[PDB]
């Protein structure tokens, strides 16, 4: 009875309690259990009638389901607050997530479970803290709620509450003798999450109740994270607690000025100069025994400006905007370190400004330094790689040369990150295998864009040879797409996507020179995809033939002169000539076809079935399977 069950579920979900009771006239208890087990993939997700009765917020519906009738609260559910489709989501968890005080009160009062565990092992208390209702948390905790249970990331409910601005929830939950020293395996000490969105009152509350400042696993103090997040007031409060430790507050002010220098959210450059002036004055306040900033090498991306040793230098660079940006980045590198994630994000933004003022020479170096840091940290760099493809495309479009070392280095890092992406694809079983595959697709597209850029420049000799070496290494990797294509297939294709930015100016696949470098670099020319097509079979499925006549000539003559059997005869029993779909393509293939005796013989014996299992050589069996 799928229709009756759908009616019952619709009545429960839409709050139609009267029609639900109408559906409850003398029904069989077996069908009632069938209604209870009607998970029935509504909305593409796991849910029972009681789960949606807690979801929508109709107390009368919940009353009719289990105050008077029988239904269990423990079912496989789905929350999807932030994509969190979590199995085992009970009625209490969803109800506390939705903030229904009456429904939660009834559910606890009749005697349902109040400490339910899900796949992410998150109690309804943590969902209530995520929503931030004082009454729900009050009623749960006084009705025997355990606060010690945390997420699969060991994310304590106090940490989740402090991540938002629920100061009442935070203060009550610490009034329930919860310790703020609950260190997650991520590294959070329940106050970093407070110092994320500038929740100043929550930070004050933790400071009052023995905050016990603890460095995370990233090596950053809460004060350092507060400075990095560009929130000044929490920097004040963290600076005014427990251990002052003058070095710590000095580097905190340095970090705060540096973060204000090159962040998109706060760009008060005068405030950057003033905070750095405070840091310098504190460095030079006591007179004797003044601690001095250590010497760092002048990294060429930030220029040869070796920090700011003396306040005279800071006064000199007071009105120097780009020098201030470089000083901010250098202070970020020195204080925040060159290992964590938070050092990467500002750098690109500064280069982004240089990307908009057409001052490409600093932008390329700065962005390349950001990429090198990302690759050293083994982070996800596909977005930055696509950014470099875009900026090279814009550089070539605006009649500007692209330096060979820059494209060589970005090709090296692209190859290395493609290696890492392949490792993630073949190593991550099911948690993020699809995300890794999409990363692989995007990286392949970006690498081909960069190869197009490399071809379309006034390249040197030996650095272009290094480019060819790197591309040959990536071809020797033999990357494959989700559609089983090779890089040759994408290079000769027109269905390969092109990024919506300035890449459309030069990324005009199929491009002649990209294919030229691809096959002259050495590649598997007969890499038939899992769909059965070849590179020639890709190019005969091309609907814009005349507009690229010279490039199409080049790719056909190149494929014919290097492998690319012109009689591939794919698994769909279609010779590449018969898929030409254009008189030009079939004419060129026929003129480029060659007299092959035991290939017309192969065509003769293909449709006319002749046994080949060990009667012909097994290499000829591979030739037949190729046919």
């Amino acid at each position: 009875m799928e229709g009756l069950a759908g009616y019952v579920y619709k009545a429960a979900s839409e709050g139609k309690v009267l029609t639900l009771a109408a559906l409850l006239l003398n029904r069989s208890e077996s069908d009632i259990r069938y209604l209870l087990g009607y998970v029935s993939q509504q909305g593409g997700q796991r849910s029972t009638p009681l789960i949606i009765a807690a979801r929508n917020g109709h107390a009368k519906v919940v009353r009719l389901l289990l105050e008077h009738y029988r239904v269990q609260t423990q079912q496989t559910g789905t929350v999807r607050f932030d994509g969190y489709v979590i199995d085992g989501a009970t009625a209490l968890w969803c109800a506390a997530g939705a903030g229904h005080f009456e429904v939660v009160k009834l559910l606890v009062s009749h005697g349902a479970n109040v400490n339910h565990t899900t796949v992410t092992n998150s109690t309804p208390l943590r969902a209530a803290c995520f929503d931030g209702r004082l009454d729900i948390v009050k009623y749960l905790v006084e009705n025997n709620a355990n606060i010690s249970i945390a997420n699969k990331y060991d994310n304590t409910c106090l940490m989740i509450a402090a991540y938002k601005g629920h100061t009442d929830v935070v203060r009550y939950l610490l009034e329930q003798r919860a310790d703020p020293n609950a260190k997650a395996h991520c590294g959070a000490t329940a106050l970093h999450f407070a110092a994320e969105a500038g929740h100043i009152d929550i930070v004050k509350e933790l400071i009052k109740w023995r905050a016990a400042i603890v460095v995370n696993g990233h090596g950053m103090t809460p004060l350092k994270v507060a400075a990095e997040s560009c929130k000044a007031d929490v920097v004040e409060l963290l600076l005014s607690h427990a251990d002052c430790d003058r070095r710590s507050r000095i580097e905190a002010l340095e970090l705060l000025g540096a973060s204000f220098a090159n962040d998109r959210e706060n760009y008060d450059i005068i405030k950057t100069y003033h905070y750095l002036y405070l840091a310098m004055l504190e460095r030079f306040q006591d007179g004797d025994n003044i601690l001095e900033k250590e010497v760092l090498p002048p990294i060429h991306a930030y220029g040869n400006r070796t920090e700011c040793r003396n306040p005279q230098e800071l006064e000199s660079i007071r009105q120097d905007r780009d020098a201030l940006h470089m000083e901010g980045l250098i202070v970020r590198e020195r204080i925040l370190g060159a290992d964590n994630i938070d050092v990467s994000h500002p750098i690109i933004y500064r280069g982004a400004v240089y990307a908009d003022n057409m001052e490409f020479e600093q932008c390329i170096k700065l962005w390349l330094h950001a990429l090198h840091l990302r690759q050293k940290g083994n982070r996800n760099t596909h977005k930055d790689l696509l950014r470099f493809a875009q900026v090279f495309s814009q550089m070539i479009h605006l009649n500007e040369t692209v330096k060979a070392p820059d494209i060589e280095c970005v090709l090296r890092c692209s190859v290395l990150e493609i290696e890492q992406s392949m490792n993630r694809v073949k190593n991550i079983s099911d948690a993020d295998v699809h995300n890794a595959m999409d990363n692989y697709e995007c990286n392949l597209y970006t690498f081909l864009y960069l190869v197009c850029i490399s071809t379309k420049t006034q390249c040197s000799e030996e650095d272009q040879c290094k480019i060819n070496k790197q591309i040959y290494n990536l071809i020797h990797l033999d990357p494959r797409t989700r559609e089983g294509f090779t890089l040759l297939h994408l290079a000769v294709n027109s269905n390969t996507p092109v990024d919506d930015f300035h890449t459309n100016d030069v990324c005009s696949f199929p491009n002649a020179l990209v294919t030229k470098l691809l096959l002259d670099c050495g590649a598997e020319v007969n890499a038939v995809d899992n769909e059965g097509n070849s590179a020639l079979h890709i190019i005969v499925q091309y609907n814009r033939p005349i507009s690229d006549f010279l490039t199409l000539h080049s790719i056909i003559i190149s494929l014919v002169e290097a492998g690319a059997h012109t009689d591939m005869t794919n698994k769909q029993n279609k010779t590449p000539l018969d898929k030409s779909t254009t008189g030009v393509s079939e004419i060129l293939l026929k003129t480029q076809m060659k007299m092959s005796l035991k290939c017309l013989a192969a065509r003769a014996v293909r449709a006319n079935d002749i046994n080949y299992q060990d009667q012909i050589p097994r290499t000829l069996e591979e030739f037949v399977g190729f046919h």
Binding site: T19, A21, A22, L25, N26, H68
Partner: protein
């Protein structure tokens, strides 16, 4: 008025009348809703459990006016 249909209006017209009554009492025009409730009660033919169940899914003034509007003895 179906006037004792065999099986069709016993389940279909009863559902229609009861749901019209529900939205009528939801919108505040609950006298026509109570009329629809009485019609659906008569149509279904087994109003025993509903006699309690529909008793506990409405405010007490609705119960008072319903018991005044229920001369089904």
């Amino acid at each position: 008025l179906p006037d004792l249909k065999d099986a069709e209006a016993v389940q279909k017209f009863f559902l229609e009348e009861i749901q019209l009554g529900e939205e009528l009492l939801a919108q505040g025009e609950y006298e026509k809703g109570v009329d629809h409730l009485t019609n659906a009660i008569a149509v279904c033919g087994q109003p025993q459990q509903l006699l309690q169940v529909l008793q506990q899914t409405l405010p007490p003034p609705v119960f008072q006016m319903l018991l005044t509007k229920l001369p089904t003895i």
